[PDB]
Enzyme design. Structure first.
Site, short mmCIF file in Angstrom:
data_model
loop_
_atom_site.label_atom_id
_atom_site.label_comp_id
_atom_site.label_asym_id
_atom_site.label_seq_id
_atom_site.Cartn_x
_atom_site.Cartn_y
_atom_site.Cartn_z
N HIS A 41 44.20 52.85 43.79
CA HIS A 41 45.27 53.68 43.25
C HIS A 41 45.81 53.21 41.91
O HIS A 41 46.77 53.77 41.38
CB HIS A 41 46.42 53.89 44.26
N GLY A 142 55.06 46.36 42.86
CA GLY A 142 54.24 45.49 42.04
C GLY A 142 53.42 44.49 42.83
O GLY A 142 52.59 43.78 42.28
N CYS A 144 51.16 45.24 45.09
CA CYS A 144 49.83 45.75 45.44
C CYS A 144 48.73 44.87 44.85
O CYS A 144 48.81 44.43 43.71
CB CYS A 144 49.68 47.19 44.96
#
Lengths: 301, 300
Positions: A41, A142, A144
């Site tokens: 993503h 943040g 991820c």
């Protein structure tokens, strides 16, 4: 003496974290060999609507990528999509790549998470993959791409890539092959996880740890057959008793059979009556027999 | 979302751990610059009775030391005793020495411990220095010399060197200046710690984290003034409330003042009654304001 939630050292892993940016989206990537792994993503054009990754990947322009390790930029030469992960091929090989392997966690298995935020590690903690395939972590926007790992037999086993946070607050990640744990989707839509179950083997390990540390006010003489405990567990939110291998070793060491502990679990599940066990006020399923034996005996099962 | 006890990354510290062997004893040391720091009892020949460290140091011979970094041996050129620590000068500088400083922990402050054994790190965990100057760690023989640290402003603050385990299982260490926390001695005779107290400031921070998450079943409207609370605390095993101003950011974000949380503490101390707060069945004082604000807002 003592039993405390611990994490395995993060040194080896820290040198593999990089900052991955695509357009205006910034998250973490794991640089091993000449490949940088990160959540797919990172190329999503939005974070409010359902994403068509097939379309997203087709319009992807590599010049939009920016990958930084420390203060150096990596050169992107290619990128492929695998499940919910992107494998970005760069010209540079990470000279700090540790000997490693990739593994998929099983229900109830423990591991370590290195929480990162701009390609930089901020914290490390031990966690367990719950039966509903989610973990009880602590993350903010943040995070991820933060990696989950285990150190074993002289190498690093990479087992988790942080991906999303459910409405409940629980966290979900994927293995490095791009398979999301639990089958959750990397979409913004509402997703609900199944009911969590108390990990019986961990609770039993925790009770044995209590015995080895001199805390046995709760220990009684009554015994409860495994077959019977399992009937109770299936209806009370607990997993079935299994293993027994390392457990028989501890039963022999302490002279306290597993049956006595299963009986204690059944009782202690109603409350500690105001008392504590190793610093806790209710049954705890966070410690595996592996962690208990390593912390008290210094040996790896 | 979430609130988890975390340790700061250990990367910069792992590279400084060495194995320190002397005679029939082996423990850990911290190599910074051209100095290796470690517990002084590594030179104690016999620990069956009282140790005369002045005597032990007088008979000490530099050639009896064996200091190993990874797989390399370090050359020992000198050694001095400072409090309960030994500062061993070696012939080479640790090229991996990080920007650092030394600091002595105050009551209730949190830090990180890198549990080391044969000169190799095996685990890392966050912990707090308790009011009775002991820590609730997890160690087995061979952990002596394990360092405690905190990362801040781009540097590593070394604050703890593991030294002993009390009969109660509590752990005690010293600062790198050689001062043992709590005044405990590195002697074989039995030593007992004082009664521990619940760190109020941390409990308050814990409740703020609860609110920031969807857990507020316990939140009421009554306000308990600091003055009144401290009166209750002294008689119930809790520390006095201090630095209320520090909680400004959390109070502003939640709209809940400290006074309401002090009232909650006094009430929840009687028990949760089957309910849980962030997964706990009793008040928790393991998280500081710093940890909560960092995990909730990403602010240091």
């Amino acid at each position: 003496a003592g039993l405390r939630k611990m994490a395995q050292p993060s040194g080896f892993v820290e040198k593999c974290v990089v900052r991955v940016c695509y357009g205006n989206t910034v998250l973490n990537g794991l640089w091993l060999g000449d490949i940088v792994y990160c959540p797919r993503h990172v190329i999503a054009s939005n974070t409010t609507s359902a994403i068509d990754y097939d379309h997203e990947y087709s319009i992807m322009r590599l010049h939009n990528f920016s990958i930084i390790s420390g203060t150096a930029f990596l050169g992107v030469v290619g990128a492929t999509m695998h499940g919910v992960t992107l494998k970005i091929k760069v010209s540079q090989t990470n000279m700090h790549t540790p000997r490693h392997s990739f593994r998929t966690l099983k229900s109830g298995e423990g591991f370590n998470i290195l929480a990162c935020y701009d390609g930089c590690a901020q914290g490390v903690f031990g966690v367990n993959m719950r039966t509903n395939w989610t973990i009880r972590g602590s993350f903010i926007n943040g995070a991820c791409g933060s990696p989950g790992y285990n150190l074993k037999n002289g190498e690093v086993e990479f087992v988790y890539m942080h991906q999303i946070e459910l409405g409940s607050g629980s966290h979900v990640g994927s293995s490095f092959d791009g398979v999301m744990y639990g089958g959750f989707e990397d979409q913004p839509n509402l997703q609900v996880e199944s009911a969590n179950q108390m990990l019986t083997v961990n609770v039993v390990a925790f009770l044995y740890a209590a015995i080895l540390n001199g805390c046995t006010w709760w220990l009684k003489g009554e015994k409860l057959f495994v077959e019977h405990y399992n009937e109770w567990a299936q209806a009370n939110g607990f997993t079935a008793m299994n293993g027994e291998d390392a457990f028989s070793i501890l039963a022999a060491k302490t002279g306290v059979c597993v049956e006595r502990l299963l009986h204690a679990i059944q009782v202690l599940n109603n409350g500690f009556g105001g008392k504590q066990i190793l610093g806790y006020s209710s049954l705890n399923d966070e410690f595996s027999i592996n962690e208990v034996v390593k912390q008290m005996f210094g040996v790896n099962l």
